[PDB]
């Protein structure tokens, strides 16, 4: 049986403030820039539709230097931090970014048509761009988040598999890391393994996995450590309706239509796909630059940061403007030529985080020791995530008890 | 005279929690995939615009194993379950799906025109796609739902009927089953019997019946067993305005126009039809992933699940993204060819259900026995739906009295 943390955790009246100064990231919005001979990255990939996972490290309160010590007994008490307030400051102006493919697989525009496509070609690919759906989300926890996507499965060995067959599909749960791609209006699938022509989705997702958070599995966890708080807001609509070009994997049944003649002797493509569009960004619909108070979590864990560790996941596509840069090769010409200038694309992104923490103490009795050991063995030993990449935040040297000297501390003292 | 269940049913203070783990369905969005020689289905049809009817089976509380028994007298008491809270968890990201026909009967675009169509052809069919209207609905009851549609009637035998005559129309009430089609913006009619050219509506409804729930008949039922609770939300608008091609069944009267000459010697088609469009999906307009509390039903039945049976009907077109898959036939070519790849379409859909139930007891006196026998004869015998198809849910082995160990039980205990 799982019990709430409010039973075996005692909260004191000591509060601390923590915060980062400013985080910046500048890079190419579509692909990394790499040296031709080498494999070392010169310009990383920074996009507005990437998961931002911050892993925050806290001081050990047992070894922390407090002006007063009489409030607890080190012989039978142990200390831990609790989160009571978070703000995610978000710079840059509001904007919308677009992406596309120079060789995207589009056959025809089927929204309105007046002639029939009676002849097939060798290459019908086009240069198409669009803007993605609108999404904001924030997740806070003490364990890394969990996402889901569609991937290939293991086929049965009863019958053989011929080239060109439909791959089998299964649903896969993984851990979201820093730099992953969010859904853009095409689904949560592995585009590298489920698409072979490399020309069906834009350039920044054509060789990546799009993942969606697994809210149902996260909230059903018995201990509720992976999610203390979450906000989400997403929207989209359809702008264009197209076809796809290729060979027909599955034929239309003969009892759904009447055969034609002349131009309509053969059938056109039935692999319709839409073009997504986020509508419009406004200041009134923003979930950032606002303080969140963590009064009572939904799960049994109520903001206790076991292991001196915090995880913050952020997605915000409402500031995704890409900047165009131009450099002149030769300036000794008074008439414009296309070949005298070079074009570049850049994206910059700005972050700020600030937190209010409360000090708690735990009495280690035999029953409490047994329960905590059953919950997590490493906690007692201290008194794994080495193959994942997160944005590391080190707050071991940024705490202050002067709570009213900071913007978030003033609000915290004002609400109470 | 019909009396409320609150008079002859006594409620105890015992609550139980039930829930399914996860339900998945993957298939083709338009038609089933079948072997050519055989008639057995390989890939079923899974679409975002299908009725989902879950038939849920509960344990018999008379034979159920309770830790305590003294709260009722088996010599004169009988037990039954009552529903007090339901949540329908809904996975996958928000999206919009589209559908169309490769040989759809469209003549001209009449929104804006500059030339007159003075010549008729043999085949003027086009490849047209669109996106449907937006609809969400949830219905809960203890009997299967009832729907209505337009169908053919029996003509009078006074005069003969010639080929090409207009079929007679009547309104027909039936039972909604799992896999039926919801209205998409073209009406609630039988497209198989009322349309003969097979080219007027897209491929996933051209040989199906679209049904609409019969709310007026459901709420007028004397006992109110078919509907305890319901939510609905639908919206659409018009994108395109077209004509139809064919022979004219009914001529325009000569007193509504002045005859033309030259290009306008004959009249163009007056069988105008619009193209529907659901507008836009947002997180703020969602009715799912929210708990429903059944405090007081509208009808006389107040959540009592007679016969240990429940029915849940769900429609949700706000997650209807179709995934495109591509398979390579030969990989020994460095230049792209259309004939070297095969294209497929898939749709996957995810469900979760969770319920809170209360235990009730009934005293069987002579008047109560007579009333219940008049209401339903099978109830006394226990102390029909074999020709319908539902998604069967078996909760006979998933109850637990530990109510706070689950996400919905925590909310239930929090609200009270």
């Amino acid at each position, epitope marked *: 049986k799982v019990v709430s943390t409010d039973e075996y955790v005692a909260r004191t009246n000591i509060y601390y403030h923590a915060g980062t100064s400013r985080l910046l990231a500048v890079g190419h919005p579509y692909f990394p820039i790499k040296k031709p001979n080498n494999n070392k990255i010169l310009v990383p990939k920074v996009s507005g539709l990437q998961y931002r996972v911050f892993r925050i490290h806290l001081p050990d309160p047992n070894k922390f230097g407090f002006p007063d010590t009489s409030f607890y007994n080190p012989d039978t008490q142990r200390l831990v931090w609790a989160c009571v307030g978070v703000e995610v400051g978000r710079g840059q102006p509001l904007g919308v970014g677009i992406s596309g493919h120079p060789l995207l697989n589009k056959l025809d525009d089927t929204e309105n048509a007046s002639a029939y496509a009676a*002849n*097939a*070609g*060798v290459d019908n690919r086009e240069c198409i761009s669009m803007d993605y759906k609108q999404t904001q989300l924030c997740l806070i926890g003490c364990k890394p988040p969990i996402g889901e996507h569609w991937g290939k499965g293991s086929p049965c060995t009863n019958v053989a598999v011929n*080239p060109g067959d439909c791959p089998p599909l299964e649903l896969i749960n993984t851990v979201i890391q820093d730099g992953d791609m969010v859904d853009t209006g095409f689904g949560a699938m592995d585009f590298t393994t489920l698409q072979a022509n490399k020309s069906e989705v834009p350039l920044d997702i054509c060789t990546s996995i799009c993942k969606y958070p697994d809210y149902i599995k996260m909230v059903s966890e018995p201990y509720g450590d992976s999610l203390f708080f979450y906000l989400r807001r997403e929207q989209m609509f359809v702008r264009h309706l197209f076809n796809r070009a*290729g*060979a*027909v994997g*599955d*034929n*239309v049944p003969d009892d759904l239509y009447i*055969k034609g*003649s*002349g131009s309509t*002797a*053969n*059938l*056109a493509s039935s692999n319709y796909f839409p073009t997504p569009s986020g509508s419009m960004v406004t200041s009134d619909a923003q979930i950032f630059n606002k303080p969140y108070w963590l009064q009572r979590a939904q799960g049994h864990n109520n903001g206790i940061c076991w292991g001196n560790q915090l995880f913050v996941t952020v997605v915000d596509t409402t500031r995704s403007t890409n900047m165009s840069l131009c450099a002149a090769i030769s300036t000794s010409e008074t008439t414009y030529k296309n070949t005298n200038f070079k074009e570049y694309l850049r994206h910059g992104e700005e972050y700020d985080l600030q937190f209010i923490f409360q000090l708690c103490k735990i009495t280690l009795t035999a029953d409490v020791m047994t329960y905590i050991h059953s919950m997590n063995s490493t906690i007692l030993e201290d008194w794994p995530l080495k193959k994942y990449t997160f944005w590391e935040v080190n707050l071991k040297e940024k705490f202050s008890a002067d709570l009213d000297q900071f913007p978030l501390g003033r609000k915290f003292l004002l609400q109470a | 005279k019909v009396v409320s269940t609150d008079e002859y049913v006594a409620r105890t203070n015992i609550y139980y929690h039930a829930g399914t783990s996860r339900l998945l369905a993957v298939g083709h969005p338009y038609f089933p995939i079948k072997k050519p020689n055989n008639n057995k289905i390989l890939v079923p049809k899974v679409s975002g615009l299908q009725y989902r009817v879950f038939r849920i089976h509960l344990p018999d509380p008379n034979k159920f194993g309770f830790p305590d028994t003294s709260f009722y007298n088996p010599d004169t008491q009988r037990l039954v379950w009552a529903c007090v809270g339901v949540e329908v968890g809904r996975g996958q990201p928000l999206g919009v799906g589209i559908s169309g026909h490769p040989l759809l009967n469209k003549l001209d675009d009449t929104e804006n025109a500059s030339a007159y169509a003075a010549n008729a052809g*043999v085949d003027n069919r086009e490849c047209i796609s669109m996106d449907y209207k937006q609809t969400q609905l949830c219905l809960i009851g203890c009997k299967p739902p009832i729907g209505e549609h337009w169908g053919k009637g029996s003509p009078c035998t006074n005069v003969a009927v010639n080929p090409g005559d207009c079929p007679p129309l009547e309104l027909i009430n039936t039972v909604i089953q799992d896999g039926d089609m919801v209205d998409t913006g073209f009406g609630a009619m039988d497209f198989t019997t009322l349309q003969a050219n097979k080219s007027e509506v897209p491929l996933d409804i051209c040989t199906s019946i679209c049904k609409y729930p019969d709310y007026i008949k459901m709420v007028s039922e004397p006992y109110g067993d078919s509907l305890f609770f319901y939510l609905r939300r639908e919206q659409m608008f018009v994108r395109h305005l077209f004509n139809r091609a064919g022979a004219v069944g009914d001529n325009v009267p000569d007193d509504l126009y002045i005859k033309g000459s030259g290009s306008t010697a004959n009249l163009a088609s007056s069988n105008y039809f619009p193209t529907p469009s659901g507008s836009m999906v947002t997180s703020d307009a969602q009715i799912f992933n929210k708990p429903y509390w059944l405090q007081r039903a509208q009808g006389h039945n107040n959540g009592i699940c007679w016969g240990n049976q429940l029915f849940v009907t769900v429609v949700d077109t706000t997650r209807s993204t179709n995934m495109s898959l591509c398979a390579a*036939i*030969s990989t020994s070519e460095t230049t792209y*060819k*259309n*004939t*070297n790849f095969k294209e497929y379409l898939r749709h996957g859909e995810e469900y979760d259900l969770q319920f809170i139930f209360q235990l009730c007891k009934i005293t069987l006196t002579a008047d109560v026995m007579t009333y219940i026998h008049s209401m339903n004869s099978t109830i006394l015998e226990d102390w029909p739906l074999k020709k319908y198809t539902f998604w069967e849910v078996n909760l006979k082995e998933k109850f637990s009295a530990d109510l706070d160990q689950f996400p919905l039980g925590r909310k239930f205990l929090l609200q009270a």
Partner: antibody
Amino acid sequence: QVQLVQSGAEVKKPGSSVKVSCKASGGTFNSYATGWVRQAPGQGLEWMGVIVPIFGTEDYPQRFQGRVTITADESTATAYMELRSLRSDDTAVYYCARSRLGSSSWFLFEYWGQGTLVTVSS
Amino acid sequence: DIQMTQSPSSLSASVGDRVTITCRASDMISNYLNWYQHKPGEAPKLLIYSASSLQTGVPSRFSGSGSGTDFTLTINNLQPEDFATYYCQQSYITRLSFGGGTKVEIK
């Protein structure tokens, strides 16, 4: 240029099934539409079936439905024709006709096989 | 399907003459007609497609014309290598069909 090569002569008994192949040898083909024709002793030409893998087309004449199957393999660029329930009137010479992608229509059958003799007798 | 009738079924000509063959369709098939030449011991060979267009590598002495239900093939200045069997073919529907065939012989 490209040449289509067919399999050898076949001798079958009534009630059996036969299968004939058609392979493109020179260059790279990238076939467009495949069809089969036959000629009986002392008769004309008879169309027996067409497949167009793009557009997903597969059509046979009414007198031949249920007994004829036409298949194409793009990895090896080989066409196959299957006849079931052979009769004594199926003794004939069979021709493979194919069209190449990049032409102006699907019915520009400019490539033909040499023909295969099939004799159904006991 | 569509039935096609080819006339005549046989004719004799001399070197340097003009030969015309008429072809008739059971329905309107626009210009979806092709003409094939067949010699003994060889495969059929395409000459005219779409009832007017001339295949590459074919002498200009061959011509074809027609539309609707009536079509015709003309050969001017007959040469010794032109003596073969000629067939119609409709491609209006995906269920193609051939004509009866006309055999040209030596006078």
